[PDB]
Amino acid sequence: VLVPNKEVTDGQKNINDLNVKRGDSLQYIVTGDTTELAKVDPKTVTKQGIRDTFDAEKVTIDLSKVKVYQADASLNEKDLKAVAAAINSGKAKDVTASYDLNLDQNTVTAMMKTNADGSVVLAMGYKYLLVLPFVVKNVEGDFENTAVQLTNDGETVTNTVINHVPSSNPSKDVKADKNGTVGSVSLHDKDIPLQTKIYYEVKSSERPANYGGITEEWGMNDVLDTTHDRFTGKWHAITNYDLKVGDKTLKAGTDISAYILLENKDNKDLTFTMNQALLAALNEGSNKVGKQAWSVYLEVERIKTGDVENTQTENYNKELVRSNTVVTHTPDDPKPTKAVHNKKGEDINHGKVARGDVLSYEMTWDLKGYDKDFAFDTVDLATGVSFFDDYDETKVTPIKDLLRVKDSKGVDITNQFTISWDDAKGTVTISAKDPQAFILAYGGQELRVTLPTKVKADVSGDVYNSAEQNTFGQRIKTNTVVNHIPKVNPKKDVVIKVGDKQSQNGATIKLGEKFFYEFTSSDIPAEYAGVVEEWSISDKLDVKHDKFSGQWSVFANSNFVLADGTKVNKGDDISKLFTMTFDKGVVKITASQAFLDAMNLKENKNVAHSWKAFIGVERIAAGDVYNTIEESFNNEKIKTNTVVTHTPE
Amino acid sequence: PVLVPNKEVTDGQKNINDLNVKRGDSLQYIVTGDTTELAKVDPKTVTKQGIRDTFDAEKVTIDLSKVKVYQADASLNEKDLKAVAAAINSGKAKDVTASYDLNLDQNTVTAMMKTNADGSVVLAMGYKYLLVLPFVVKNVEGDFENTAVQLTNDGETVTNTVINHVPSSNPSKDVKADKNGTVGSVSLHDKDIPLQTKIYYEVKSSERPANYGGITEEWGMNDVLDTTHDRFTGKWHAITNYDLKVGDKTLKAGTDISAYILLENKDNKDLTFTMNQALLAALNEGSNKVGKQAWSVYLEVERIKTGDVENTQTENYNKELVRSNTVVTHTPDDPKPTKAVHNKKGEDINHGKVARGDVLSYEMTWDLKGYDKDFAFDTVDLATGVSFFDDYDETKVTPIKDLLRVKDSKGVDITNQFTISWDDAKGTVTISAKDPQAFILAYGGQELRVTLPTKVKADVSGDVYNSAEQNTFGQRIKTNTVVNHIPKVNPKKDVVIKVGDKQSQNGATIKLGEKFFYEFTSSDIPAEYAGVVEEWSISDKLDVKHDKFSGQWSVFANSNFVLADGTKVNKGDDISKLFTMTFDKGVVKITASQAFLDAMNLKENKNVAHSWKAFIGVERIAAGDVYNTIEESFNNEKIKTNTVVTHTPE
Ligand SMILES: [Mg+2]
Ligand SMILES: [Mg+2]
């Protein structure tokens, strides 16, 4: 036979049985020797050509690029470098126009043209090389090629070549960005806080091992939703396999950013392409033994709430393939708030209160944007999940046992936190014991913090509270609330008869003379926002000088109604609404519950309220006699001024 | 006639009958014998005139040399004790003590007028004669009374009886936390106080009683510090415990009176705090004697030595000293956490040379021996936590996070009491108790054991330091540092014609059909290797289109060693029987058998470095350039050799 030969080539070497990739531009070369046919009369050669059967499902052949060359029969067609030099030098002569070429589906035929006498027009004694340039489609699996040499009425088959197109697709992921370093956990389908910077990971497909193609271009494109993702300009690229460049091996994982060109259109349409030096290195033989792949990390700031999708499109040899689509979600920032209530549950911001009153601070702890889908890898978990409150320790005292945290269903969950008190600075920090576990079981809702405090005795002025939420370092402050503590000043005086105008403070009281100690209570202001639950005076009498025989009265210093409607006018005797005990030389006069209830009625909040008390005594010995009264309001004691009377001996 | 003598008790200005007094008070009894009715009789018939006073010598002290008699105008009101004191001071009431015979016998003072030759008393009748008996209250309890009798010739008339009370009240000492200079509210008595803690000693005065009739002449408290344990820092403050009016201002209970207190400081050891003259004067104002008076000093000391530390104070009230109770605190040694590094067999390998894939198991002690239920929690900020920190070299080892453990001194795993925080960027792990105070009550008082296993990374070399640190409520104590070494390795691939050859054919032409060998030289296992090799193998992915392998392979010993059963192996020996071969998917894999691994981990072989050479026989099949690279796996960690190349023409 004639032994026609068939090879597949990248243009320099035999690439039979090698892996190729979408868009590869390669060649088949079929040689039909006519050396043996040079021995007969050339006029007896009336048919000469090649019928080539290729796989049009997997490769594309442009008939206008098909060529036939007349080579010296000494040329070793197996030496594909020598063939390319021969084609380039002209020692393999282009004779294509002396052939009839046809393409039909899987079939390319090249037959020599014939003279009028029927004999083929080209000389025998030469090797004729049919060159079929082809382009690999974006397909999977094998493709074979075989040919037949046609000589007059006979046919001889060539050897069969084959190439493979292994599967590999581009992909995209989302990674955390800790001060520029890439995290190692995927953030797909997770929740990213506003202003967090994250990495988009755009991963090329893999170039297969034992590569017989040529990487002519390699690029990755990412079009960003610029209303949600702000490209910061910071990016890097790494090689995912060992890559030799010049005299050095760039090991797998090494940065190759310098070899990647960025085309940035308005921070929206970003294209990363390999430069010429890198493409040249990829085409060197040792880099085709193993796989090659690369990935780009591009940094975006999340600037808007919602669901944010990302996709990339990989260009390999002009063949575009889109990756998977990744999504992340961005919630509204937390909106923690602060309020102040009284003991009845009523809101009393800006309200005036008195010693011993309960100021119940109620805060919302807003964890609606932090739940099981949170991107924990974006934060330093050790910074904790906490709530902080800065109260005025010079004016209020927290009831530490009653600090509670409740969830949105009203369930006490205080036991999930450690509570740290800083008494000197007057702050309290509530910290989740197990932050990640806490976000999983209790996140996704608003929590309610209750911080009861009590107004101190003998302080006045404005009382501020503020608070702050700290979620893994995201610090959001609440509003500030304020209460007012008007100064009070209960007084003691001395009068001869109940209702006298002339003070006897500092005056002479004779032996056997009867007189009255007079008391004026603290004022509760108009629109008082607290709740008075106790109101009394204690007068420790100097029993050797002042003799108490049970005489006392209390008078209204304001107009008010009782719960049962009965009116009380300023100056009225209301001793019926008070009680008196005398024990261990102490006169104690105490407001009844009927009087307290009256002081707390909304109907009486239009005016301020106070009362006057009188304690009847007889001076029974000589000397100087001091008197001070202790007034108790909400069980908090303060002292009147100290009065003085003189009984000379 | 008839006579009514009077007896009064005074602080010098006022009637103090029935009032409360205090140790060391300086007071006076005054007995008035009126002789106005006796002025009408013949003075020669008055032959005996005087007073016999009966006091409580068990409760007050009278010095006879201070007893005086004054001759006062009969119009002087001896009940106006201010008027009496002025008359005595000016001489308007004349001192006639020289005309009296005075005597003190136990509970009795007698003062009798002297007499002329005829027996008549030497002093004129018609005056009031005031006998003044100054006394000092002793440190006693309960009541003391005084009564006198006026003697007129053979008659006797008793005076009224006066009485005072000595209510009991002692000084005290306590110990309070010192947080940023503010005083804690929890008593640290008998609690555990770490070294370098600043605490407040609280020295509290006794109480001056309500309804006071005395005079506070001086008031001080003294504290002698043990300067080997307590370093006085120089800062202190004082508070009043009751309302104290000064001038026309009222210092309410609890407010600071430091400006009125003086500190005499002898060498930071002997501290005495005393009320200044302005405060003493305010304490004598009448309104300040109605109710109680008392004060406290807070003095700051740094605890600078371990052991049991006692403190006591001595209160000086009107020169009478009373010692307070004695408080005690305890100071244990600081924690002594340690760090060690063990290989996978459990041997300590500090300074040991190690290799890729080897386990460096860091074992640390977490010393909480001094932190138990008696700990003074009020001295620390609880938010600072209870934690243990390890800073490993993240560029050379990687931790096996799932195997981090904490155990107590009884071997119980307690890892779930802690939050484990990994910082991969700085290469640290922080182990913090979820509930720090509760954790100390439940698990404090023992030594905990922390296990942090790590593996050596592939393709790294040099020194590997590890250190750790114990943070107990802000008390930071470092462990020792351990170090390991990772000698560089360089397994290589080469090309030769025959196994023994030395002429490298890397980069040379090998003709078509020619048979040759790929040569591999393993990584070195160092002399004195401290790790453990559990896997050692090479994989060579052959270019099957060009290199034809048909089962020819050899492994040569590159060092001398011995086996478990005794067999001796020399350098250059063929040891292929201690290796196995597979040829799957064009990849030749040559693997060390367990018996060769067992050999490389024997102590007997540790004197020398160890490696091996392998040879893979191949026949070249096609023309063109042919590349070869080998991946060597050591403890399942892969690194690759140099890449060789050969050329075949035609
Ligand atoms: Mg505060
Ligand atoms: Mg580190």
Residue numbers in the entry:
A (entry chain B): 585 to 1233
B (entry chain A): 584 to 1233
Lines from the paper:
PrgB is the main adhesin produced by pCF10 and has been studied for well over three decades. PrgB seems to consist of an N-terminal disordered region (residues 35–197), followed by a newly identified coiled-coil (COI) domain (residues 198–257), the previously crystallized polymer adhesin domain (residues 261–558), a linker region (residues 559–582), four immunoglobulin (Ig)-like domains (residues 583–1232), and finally the C-terminal disordered region containing the LPXTG motif (residues 1263–1305) that gets anchored to the cell wall.
Surprisingly, the resulting electron density lacked the previously crystallized polymer adhesin domain of PrgB, and instead only contained residues 584–1233. The modeled protein indeed consists of four Ig-like domains: two CSA and two CSC domains. The Ig-like domains seem to come in pairs of two slightly different structures, denoted as CSA1–CSC1 (first pair) and CSA2–CSC2 (second pair), as named in InterPro (CSA from IPR026345; adhesin isopeptide-forming adherence domain, and CSC from IPR032300; cell-surface antigen C-terminal). In each of the Ig-like domains of PrgB, isopeptide bonds are formed between a lysine and an asparagine, a bond which is further stabilized by an aspartic acid. The homologous C2 domains from AspA, Pas, SpaP, and SspB, each have an extra structural feature termed the BAR (SspB adherence region) domain, which mediates adherence in these proteins.
